[PDB]
A paper describes a structure:
Zinc is essential for virulence and survival and is acquired solely by the ABC transporter, AdcCB, and two Zn2+-specific cluster A-I SBPs, AdcA and AdcAII, in S. pneumoniae. Although both SBPs share this structural core, AdcA also has a C-terminal domain (residues 322 to 501; here termed AdcAC) that is structurally related to ZinT, a periplasmic protein from E. coli and Salmonella. The AdcAC domain is linked to the N-terminal cluster A-I domain of AdcA (residues 1 to 311, henceforth referred to as AdcAN) by an 11-amino-acid linking region. Collectively, our data show that the AdcAN domain is necessary and sufficient for Zn2+ acquisition, with the AdcAC domain and the His-rich loop aiding in Zn2+ recruitment during growth under Zn2+-restricted conditions.
The AdcAN domain has a two-lobed organization, with the N- and C-terminal (α/β)4 lobes bisected by a cleft in which the metal binds. The binding site in AdcAN is comprised of three Nε2 atoms from His63, His140, and His204 and one Oε2 atom from Glu279. These four residues bind a single Zn2+ ion via 4-coordinate geometry, with bond distances of 1.98 to 2.08 Å. Intriguingly, the AdcAN domain was observed in a conformation that partially exposed the metal-binding site to bulk solvent, with the relative solvent accessibility of the metal-binding residues (His63 > His140 > His204 ≈ Glu279) remaining the same during the five independent MD simulations. The partial opening of the Zn2+-binding site of the AdcAN domain arises from the α7β6 loop having moved away from the binding site due to rigid-body rotational movements of α7 in a plane perpendicular to the helical hinge interlobe helix α5. This conformation was also observed for the truncated AdcA variant that lacked AdcAC, AdcAN (residues 27 to 309). The high-resolution crystal structure of Zn2+-bound truncated AdcAN did not reveal any conformational differences by comparison with the N-terminal domain of the full-length, wild-type protein. Metal binding was restricted to Zn2+ ions, with differential scanning fluorimetry (DSF) showing that other divalent first-row transition metal ions did not induce stabilization of the N-terminal domain. In the AdcAN domain, the metal-binding site is located beneath the surface of the protein and is largely preformed in the absence of ligand. This permits the bioinorganic chemistry of the site to be tightly defined and likely aids in achieving selectivity for Zn2+ over other metal ions.
Residue numbers in the entry: 27 to 119, 136 to 309
Amino acid sequence: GKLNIVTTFYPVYEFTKQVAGDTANVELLIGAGTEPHEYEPSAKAVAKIQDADTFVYENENMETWVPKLLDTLDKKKVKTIKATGDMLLLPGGEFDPHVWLSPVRAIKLVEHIRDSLSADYPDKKETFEKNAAAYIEKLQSLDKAYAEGLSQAKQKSFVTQHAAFNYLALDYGLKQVAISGLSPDAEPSAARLAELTEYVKKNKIAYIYFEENASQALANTLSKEAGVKTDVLNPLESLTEEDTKAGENYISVMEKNLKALKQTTDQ
Ligand SMILES: [Zn+2]
């Protein structure tokens, strides 16, 4: 019947479902409201993976538990796919795994998933290739929107609370500045607030981007004390249940990210 495929977190799920389409029941292991950077599967989740037909993960530098799991899998039926393949990676903040925030790299991940599924299930190669080709067409339009909207950036540097955008920066000619010690929910101390205010002023920072909407308390404090606005650059590591309700997907969230980023890069 239908292939049973287990994927780790949202972009791996989305790219795999786009390629597999109706040939497969694609399960999302790390769902909405859980952090993929900290997740590790329980024994029952591990058993689910081992008896799947296919398991897709993004990269061992993201799902750092996958290397230990791979050693058990030769006595198990599941065939595995590393979505990033042999893509070379940037150094970590020990390599940076966040390649899917660059549309041109997302195309490469889709192509690799297509080719791996095609090699594992030759009788479905026609379907994998036609599903992948239609989605890659959509990713190419996203890539063009990014290239057109960011290539003439007057302001090349952008400040983010989650450092997921180094490949976006590399591939589209920008500079990610990561800031730690802020959470979308935090109320920073007076001393922390003063550090941010000095940085914001001496570098003319217009926005701080968060992985989800800053709390109304944090946004008001940053405006009144630091003179900086806030917005969202979503690393697409897990959709909120809100976003899942509204039908957001990789491309729509990437379009929202572009719009938010241009508030900085267009000056
Ligand atoms: Zn991340």
